[PDB]
Amino acid sequence: SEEQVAQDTEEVFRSYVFYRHQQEQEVAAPADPEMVTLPLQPSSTMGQVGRQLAIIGDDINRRYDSEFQTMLQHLQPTAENAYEYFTKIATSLFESGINWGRVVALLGFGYRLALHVYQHGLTGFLGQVTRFVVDFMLHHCIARWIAQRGGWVAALNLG
Numbered sequence: 001s002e003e004q005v006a007q008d009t010e011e012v013f014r015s016y017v018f019y020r021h022q023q024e025q026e027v028a029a030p031a032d033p034e035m036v037t038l039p040l041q042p043s044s045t046m047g048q049v050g051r052q053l054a055i056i057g058d059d060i061n062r063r064y065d066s067e068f069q070t071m072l073q074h075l076q077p078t079a080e081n082a083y084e085y086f087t088k089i090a091t092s093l094f095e096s097g098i099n100w101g102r103v104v105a106l107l108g109f110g111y112r113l114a115l116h117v118y119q120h121g122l123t124g125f126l127g128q129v130t131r132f133v134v135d136f137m138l139h140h141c142i143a144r145w146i147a148q149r150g151g152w153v154a155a156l157n158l159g
Helices: 002-023 045-075 082-093 100-119 126-139 142-148 152-157
Strands: none
Touching: 002 045, 002 100, 002 126, 002 142, 002 152, 045 082, 045 100, 045 152, 082 100, 082 126, 100 126, 100 142, 126 142
């Protein structure tokens, strides 16, 4: 069900966020303690899905990242508008269709958004970004799509 994939996203994302972050610490990366302080369950199935996504995120992040950074300075989001912004950008990743790389990038952006806002004083925002990601997927058929493919675990087969 799309509902299941949507409810699994919390862990997948948090885990992706943990792994993307840990890996990102091996130059002198943006510093964010909230991302390791993450409620995470490291090697559970979803934890494994998040890790695998973070790993694959590697070259996908090369088109996407620098770009997410830039726009983030463009309109520098507040707890108040950040939703409409996450939405403007997430909506653009699926313009021309959905696929795993685009999905991985949704997280990548969820991740950059989280990091960027923390950089600017906003603490405890991961739960909210996580809801942005989940809410967006439900309403934009991403959750339905992942389901159609066998769910988040289907990502275990990408690498």
